[PDB]
Amino acid sequence: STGFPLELLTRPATERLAYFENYTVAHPRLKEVYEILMRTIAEPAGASFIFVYGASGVGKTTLRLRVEQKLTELALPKLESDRARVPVVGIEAIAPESRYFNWKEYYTRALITLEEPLIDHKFDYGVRGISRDNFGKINVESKVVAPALRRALENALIHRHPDVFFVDEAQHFGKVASGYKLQDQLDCLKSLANMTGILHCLLGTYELLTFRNLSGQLSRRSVDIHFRRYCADSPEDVQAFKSVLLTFQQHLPLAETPNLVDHWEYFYERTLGCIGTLKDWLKRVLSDALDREATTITLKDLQKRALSVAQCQKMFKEIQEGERQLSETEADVQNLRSALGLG
Amino acid sequence: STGFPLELLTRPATERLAYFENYTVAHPRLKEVYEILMRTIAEPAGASFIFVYGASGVGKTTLRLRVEQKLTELALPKLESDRARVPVVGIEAIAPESRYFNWKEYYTRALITLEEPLIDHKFDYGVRGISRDNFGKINVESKVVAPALRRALENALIHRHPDVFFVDEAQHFGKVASGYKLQDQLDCLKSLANMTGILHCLLGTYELLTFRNLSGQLSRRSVDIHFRRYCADSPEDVQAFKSVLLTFQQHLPLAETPNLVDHWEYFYERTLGCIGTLKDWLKRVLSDALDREATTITLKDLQKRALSVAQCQKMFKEIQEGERQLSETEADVQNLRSALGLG
Ligand SMILES: Nc1ncnc2c1ncn2[C@@H]1O[C@H](COP(=O)(O)OP(=O)(O)OP(=O)(O)O)[C@@H](O)[C@H]1O
Ligand SMILES: Nc1ncnc2c1ncn2[C@@H]1O[C@H](COP(=O)(O)OP(=O)(O)OP(=O)(O)O)[C@@H](O)[C@H]1O
Numbered sequence A, B: 001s002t003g004f005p006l007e008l009l010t011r012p013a014t015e016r017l018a019y020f021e022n023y024t025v026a027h028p029r030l031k032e033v034y035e036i037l038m039r040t041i042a043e044p045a046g047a048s049f050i051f052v053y054g055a056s057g058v059g060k061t062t063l064r065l066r067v068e069q070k071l072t073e074l075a076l077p078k079l080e081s082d083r084a085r086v087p088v089v090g091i092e093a094i095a096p097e098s099r100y101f102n103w104k105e106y107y108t109r110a111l112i113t114l115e116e117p118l119i120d121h122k123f124d125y126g127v128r129g130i131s132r133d134n135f136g137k138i139n140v141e142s143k144v145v146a147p148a149l150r151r152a153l154e155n156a157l158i159h160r161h162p163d164v165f166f167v168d169e170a171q172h173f174g175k176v177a178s179g180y181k182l183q184d185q186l187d188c189l190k191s192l193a194n195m196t197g198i199l200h201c202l203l204g205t206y207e208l209l210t211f212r213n214l215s216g217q218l219s220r221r222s223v224d225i226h227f228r229r230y231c232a233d234s235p236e237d238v239q240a241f242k243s244v245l246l247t248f249q250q251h252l253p254l255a256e257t258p259n260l261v262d263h264w265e266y267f268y269e270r271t272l273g274c275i276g277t278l279k280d281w282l283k284r285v286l287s288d289a290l291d292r293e294a295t296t297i298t299l300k301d302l303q304k305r306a307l308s309v310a311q312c313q314k315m316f317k318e319i320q321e322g323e324r325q326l327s328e329t330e331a332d333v334q335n336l337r338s339a340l341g342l343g
């Protein structure tokens, strides 16, 4: 069957909720973005950054988890033969309490997350302020200055040599005081990548376009992957969203399968085509309908956990201007030819 | 009976005062908001913030206490088997002495409040500057810097894994020196909730509306619960307020039960429909009556401990602006569909 296992109706509420939460659906936009990211991570070819722009509810974190799992699986059979190598290191950027981004905490937490192998792996990193402990976790004193932590992190990266270096929620890199300091931040990241030869992938919302093409040297070693949502002007995206809604309602662990394709306009209204937001909405609706033990979902149930109109109104405002910066037209190509003299 | 026990008349005034103090009434708005908050807490579904707006007088603190007690009771049967688990942790935000909201005190106070379990729970907090003592109290020195406290708090939250982390008086988060820093504070909170996976509930007055819509990412993961007051324009709210007044006068431990529905316009005028204001005003009147040993209450007595016209006039100005900003109309949906192209 193309739907959920019908045995779940005998199971209690927790099992059905867990099954619905653990389900990952495959849709064309996620598939194409995942394929492009796999291709650009297989060989960087003189690139140090992968910029993955995606709106609030597009699947950035779950895509990162999926690619992390696939990279670990692909590295597994040679990992049995080759040691001193991690497949992938995944970290998330921290929004600082102060006005500027704190690089010392970033470096120490990068060392913490990267350095969790089995205790047999000993390297004796540089600087005397970094070591192991009795629990096997790296201890970092408060007296170590930021360049020392950077040198130790560089040594760890060049030793382990991960395939990619994931920095989730990369929007937090833009919290600085000086207007021009954005270039300096991105150049610091580039310098960290260069000595280690480690491809960095930055995941963030459409705000991350502030780091897009702020320098030509940085523009050369960056790859722009757009995790586009589903539009409404294009009938193809509308049909894709309808099909994904059909797949979701097909696999909902309920006694009566609800009909959802009728109010596709309603579902698009409160999700803007985002897939993670729709999945969370359906999860909350399922939890509500399963607390009352109702054999189905009712419209008013969708109205209960739907996001506020003000919330969805503004999300479109930042998405619409975000896509405008990412819009590539034939006019831009012609100006490139005219500037280059190739006309 | 539907009112206070008649035996309390023989008892001295202290027990009558205590009984009226601990007595709590159930009214439709409080029940609805409590149900919504419990539903949101049970299945956050990728939501890290619950912004519980409400005027000063709606019962936000009492709602928080009731939710805390009910969650503790619900988690008790599972807490019998599984240990090292706190059902719910609640802390109150502190208005800073300086011009900026300090985060070091917030982190250390969250660590103190979160970590008060049975001494058998040992988790060896990160960073060497935080440890236990001879009296079971968390020791935090001035040696540690704010990122170290943040790391220790994050590890403690991950290990304990509370269902929800209540933050009362959340308006104090707005004490900043820069306008963009107001968004930066919420970004820091979002990162803290993301990297630990702990649901954060913000309870505050209508000045919390400055945190309502800012960045699409924050809007996607921020539930809005409105603890609306009882308006006078709608007859249903007037009837509910009159029912609350009637049960309050039924529950007043006096030899003679006064007539309170008659002066419902006055109460309102001096309470604006907030149940907490009515409750504490009646508490003051009853305390005066018990001090005078008077069998009943008079309007005069109400006039003695009422609220000044200037006080209530400032109340309605902030409430009027708070409800105006939170007003969701069908016209607003029309622009959203028109902007989305679904009209
Ligand atoms: N294809 C998918 N299948 C199942 N669940 C998905 C899918 N895409 C997203 N989700 C859900 O979305 C959530 C993960 O967050 P998601 O990656 O969608 O966020 P984002 O909006 O891209 O980023 P951010 O966390 O920065 O706002 C999880 O609840 C996950 O179940
Ligand atoms: N439903 C209720 N039944 C009884 N007493 C209530 C009720 N709601 C509020 N109170 C009273 O209100 C007081 C608690 O403060 P309350 O939560 O009402 O304040 P608030 O205005 O919502 O919040 P804040 O403290 O931020 O101003 C107590 O005196 C409590 O007895």
Ligand SMILES: [Mg+2]
Pocket: A059, A060, A061, A062
């Ligand atoms: Mg995400």
Ligand SMILES: [Mg+2]
Pocket: B059, B060, B061, B062
């Ligand atoms: Mg209160």
